[PDB]
Structure formats: structure tokens, C-alpha cells
């Protein structure tokens, strides 16, 4: 009865994840800005029947909490679902924390009370998150004390998530052990919050490891410690809340409601601070290292993924253009190049790619150009795509290189590649192939060369 394009217009992409793309859209009548989640039906398997999805959607539309992302509308066509909801521009919680000079137990508690309030409300309405992680914690502004909104509540129950490694990064740390074995309820959200809390107070995951399986092994046994030197500087009340949140048996684990009433929360979330605020210096250092490592492993997989996409394009675009060339003169006009690049985009699984074509064609013509030699257009068009892909990877590398040495050690490579599920011997062999005189260090171009060889390029 209702169609998406008649009510909204895509402005720009906000991101991509395990369910699909999140696009910044504006209402065509009211000018209202919002985040639209586009989910492909052919790409994403439905866990429940459409009737169960349509019912939860109606419930989510009726719910309102200051710590939960608002779902406004829901649309559906032949091959997609459209989850239209509120937009937040503050970015991810952890990306803000890493910019701070000081971080206290008060800071962490005020952060965790926000998360806990949202969870309590959702649980009251029988809605479980299940996949709660730092990436699901958005801010309204990139500042300290800013309001937190939890994204993706109830998504998990209806949609089977992406098993691709690019989407699996940073997930094993947070998952409750009962979710792994199949029997779980709302208590699984408390466990994930407890893991976030442990990281806020130490900058280290309680269940850590070299690769995904190793972390899952730790999670599954459920044993962790406060044995790190930075825990000496943390209050016993904070440790006692974590112990209750990371309690193995879900029946024996504290509720989201009772965690709000815990001594640490009620004491450290006072409007007027009544406690000592020493900075958790070692924690803030570890949170920057953890974050940087996560973001680099994410960027490495995106770069390899986007190279396995850019190789399809260079040959496919020259074919499309050759077909369009009636004269055989290797030339085309502005309209033909536009029609050609649009055809290349129509054969894929982004919604904003067709509208973005004209501006990109003109940007290529600015350096190139009438009657344009398509071969010159193609190389210039693909090189720009290659460059943007390289720059994204570079920003991540520069961010990870905290001491500005220009190099990453073999130890750091082991960690990055472990998080991105690249086999030790595989990456080590690619390293020997790239530089024969390698001495346990790679600069940005050697790193980029390594990832190229790791995706058959």
C-alpha cells in the first residue's frame, strides 16, 4: 500500500553491516532526516514468518525510551525491507572515549546506567537485543556526557546475520555463553553489558584470544579474572557488579533492572559527584589500542573486499562501453558514459549508486575532457575508486600507528591478522614474497601489498 521512494530520498551512506546498508534519508514533505536500514530479502534469510516480523515492528513503533533508537516506519517491496528510524551523528561511544585525556569510574558508570536503562525498558516490553556490542552504542553528539542510543534491538530475532568475517569482527568478545549453546533469554543482554563495563574499567576484554575461536573458547568456559594491574585502581563495588553481570547461569545472573539498583550505579551516577574521580590512565591507553586494532582489522577486510569488487568493474565497464559504441570509434558522449556506469551499478546486490553516477562521471570528465575516449574514462574512473579504497585503509593504518613510527611490528601483525581471521603461515608467506629483506616490520605500502596478495592480487 505504501512505497519507500515516494516518502524518502537518500542523501548519503551512513554505513554497512551484517544486515545491509544504513542510508541517511530526508522526508520529501517534512524535510525530516533519518537513518534507513536497507535489508535484501535474497541476501538475508528470515528467522520468523512475515506475520511475526510485522507484529514486532508495530510494537517497536509504539515504544519510546531516551536510550533506544526510535523506529519510525517500516517498508517492503519485492526484494527489500526498509527500517526507517532516528539518525544520530555523535558516532560510536568508543570512538569518543579514545579522544579523552582522563576517564573515571563515574564516566563509565554514567555510560553504563544509560545502556542499562534502555535494556530494562526493552526487557519490560519482552524485547531482547542478543548482539549487544560497543558499535551498537551511538551518541547524539561526539562529546563527553552525551546521550547514548542503542541501535538494533530485536533485529536478531527475525534476521539471520552475515557469516562473512568482515561482519563477524568484534562480536565474539560480547556474546553470552548460552547464546553459543542455543538456549537464551533477556539475561544474555546483561552479560554483554558486563563485558562492555569490564572493557570501560580496564581497556581489556575479559575473554580475549588470538583469533575468533580462541575468544569463543574463553567465553564458553566463562572464566575471567581481575588479575590485571589496572584493576588495583578500580573500586570493589564495580568488581561486584561485573561478577553479578558475568554470572554463568542466566537464572543466577542479575537482571538489567536490579543492576540499576546496584550500589556502584546508585553511588557513581549521582547528579552531584560524591566520590573520588582518579583517571583510569592505563584503561584509556588499552581502550585506544583495542579500538585501533579493531578498526584496522575491519579496514583490512573492507579493502580486500573492495578489491575483489573493483576487479569485476574494469573489464565489465569496457564491455558495456564497447557494446554502446555503434561506430567502433572507441568514443562516447557524456550521456552514454552516464548510461554505461548506471548499467554497471544495476548489476549488484548500494541503493544510492544510480543517483551518484552523474557527479562521478563529471568528476572523471574534469580530468579527462564532446566525444570522449571511453578507455581513458575507464582507467581514470577505476583509479579514482582504487585511490579512495587505499586512502580509507591508510587512515586506519595511521590511526593504529600511535607513535608515528610509520611501521607495524610482526607482533602487531599477528594480532591484526588474528582478529581478521587470516592464517599465521599464510600472512607470514605473503610477507616473505613482498620483501626478502624483511626484519619484522612493515610500512603502510608493504601492509597494503600484503592484503593485495591475500585476496589474489
TrEMBL record:
ATP binds at residue 37. It is an enzyme of class 2 (transferase). Residues 8-265 form the Protein kinase domain. Belongs to the protein kinase superfamily. Ser/Thr protein kinase family. CDPK subfamily. This is non-specific serine/threonine protein kinase. Its cofactor is Mg(2+). Its EC number is 2.7.11.1. Pfam families: EF-hand_7 (PF13499), Pkinase (PF00069). Ca(2+) 4 binds at residues 435, 437, 439, 441, 446. GO terms for molecular function: ATP binding; calcium ion binding; protein serine/threonine kinase activity. Keywords: ATP-binding, Calcium, Kinase, Metal-binding, Nucleotide-binding, Repeat, Serine/threonine-protein kinase, Transferase. Residues 312-347, 356-387, 388-417, 422-457 form the EF-hand domain. CDD domains: EFh, STKc_CAMK. Ca(2+) 1 binds at residues 325, 327, 329, 331, 336. It catalyses: L-threonyl-[protein] + ATP = O-phospho-L-threonyl-[protein] + ADP + H(+); L-seryl-[protein] + ATP = O-phospho-L-seryl-[protein] + ADP + H(+). It comes from Toxoplasma gondii. Disulfide bonds join 204-455. Ca(2+) 3 binds at residues 401, 403, 405, 407, 412. Transmembrane segments: none annotated. Ca(2+) 2 binds at residues 369, 371, 373, 376.
Amino acid at each position: 500500500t505504501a512505497i519507500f521512494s515516494d516518502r524518502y530520498k537518500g542523501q548519503r551512506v551512513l554505513g554497512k553491516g551484517s544486515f545491509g546498508e544504513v542510508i541517511l534519508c530526508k522526508d520529501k514533505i517534512t524535510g525530516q532526516e533519518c537513518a534507513v536500514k536497507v535489508i535484501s530479502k535474497r541476501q538475508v534469510k528470515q528467522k520468523t514468518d512475515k506475520e511475526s516480523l510485522l507484529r514486532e515492528v508495530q510494537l517497536l513503533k509504539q515504544l519510546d525510551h531516551p536510550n533506544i533508537m526510535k523506529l519510525y516506519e517500516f517498508f517492503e517491496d519485492k526484494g527489500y525491507f526498509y527500517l526507517v528510524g532516528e539518525v544520530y551523528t555523535g558516532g560510536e561511544l568508543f570512538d569518543e572515549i579514545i579522544s579523552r585525556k582522563r576517564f573515571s569510574e563515574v564516566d563509565a558508570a554514567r555510560i553504563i546506567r544509560q545502556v542499562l536503562s534502555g535494556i530494562t525498558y526493552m526487557h519490560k516490553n519482552k524485547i531482547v537485543h542478543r548482539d549487544l556490542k560497543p558499535e551498537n552504542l551511538l551518541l547524539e553528539s561526539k562529546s563527553k556526557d552525551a546521550n547514548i542510543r542503542i541501535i538494533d534491538f530485536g533485529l536478531s530475532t527475525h534476521f539471520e546475520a552475515s557469516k562473512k568475517m568482515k561482519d563477524k569482527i568484534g562480536t565474539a568478545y560480547y556474546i553470552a555463553p548460552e547464546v553459543l549453546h542455543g538456549t537464551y533469554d533477556e539475561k544474555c543482554d546483561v552479560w554483554s553489558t558486563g563485558v562492555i563495563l569490564y572493557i570501560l574499567l580496564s581497556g581489556c576484554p575479559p575473554f580475549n584470544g588470538a583469533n575468533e575461536y580462541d575468544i569463543l573458547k574463553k567465553v564458553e568456559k566463562g572464566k575471567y579474572t581481575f588479575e590485571l594491574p589496572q584493576w588495583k585502581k578500580v573500586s570493589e563495588s564495580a568488581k561486584d557488579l561485573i561478577r553479578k553481570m558475568l554470572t554463568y547461569v542466566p537464572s543466577m545472573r542479575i537482571s538489567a533492572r536490579d543492576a540499576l539498583d546496584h550500589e556502584w550505579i546508585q553511588t557513581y551516577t549521582k547528579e552531584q559527584i560524591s566520590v573520588d574521580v582518579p583517571s583510569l590512565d592505563n584503561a584509556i591507553l588499552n581502550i585506544r589500542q583495542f579500538q585501533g586494532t579493531q578498526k584496522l582489522a575491519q579496514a583490512a577486510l573492507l579493502y580486500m573486499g573492495s578489491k575483489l569488487t573493483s576487479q569485476d568493474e574494469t573489464k565489465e565497464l569496457t564491455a558495456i562501453f564497447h557494446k554502446m559504441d555503434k561506430n567502433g570509434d572507441g568514443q562516447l558522449d557524456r550521456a552514454e558514459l552516464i548510461e554505461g556506469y548506471k548499467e554497471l551499478m544495476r548489476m549488484k546486490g548500494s541503493m544510492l549508486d544510480a543517483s551518484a553516477v552523474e557527479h562521478e562521471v563529471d568528476q572523471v570528465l574534469d580530468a579527462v575532457d564532446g566525444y570522449i575516449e571511453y578507455s581513458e574514462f575507464v582507467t581514470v574512473a577505476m583509479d579514482r575508486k582504487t585511490l579512495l579504497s587505499r586512502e580509507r585503509l591508510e587512515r586506519a593504518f595511521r590511526m593504529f600507528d600511535s607513535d608515528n613510527s610509520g611501521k607495524i611490528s610482526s607482533t602487531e601483525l599477528a594480532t591484526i591478522f588474528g582478529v581478521s581471521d587470516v592464517d599465521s603461515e599464510t600472512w607470514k608467506s605473503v610477507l616473505s614474497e613482498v620483501d626478502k629483506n624483511n626484519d619484522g616490520e612493515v610500512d603502510f605500502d608493504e601492509f597494503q601489498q600484503m592484503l593485495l596478495k591475500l585476496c589474489g592480487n
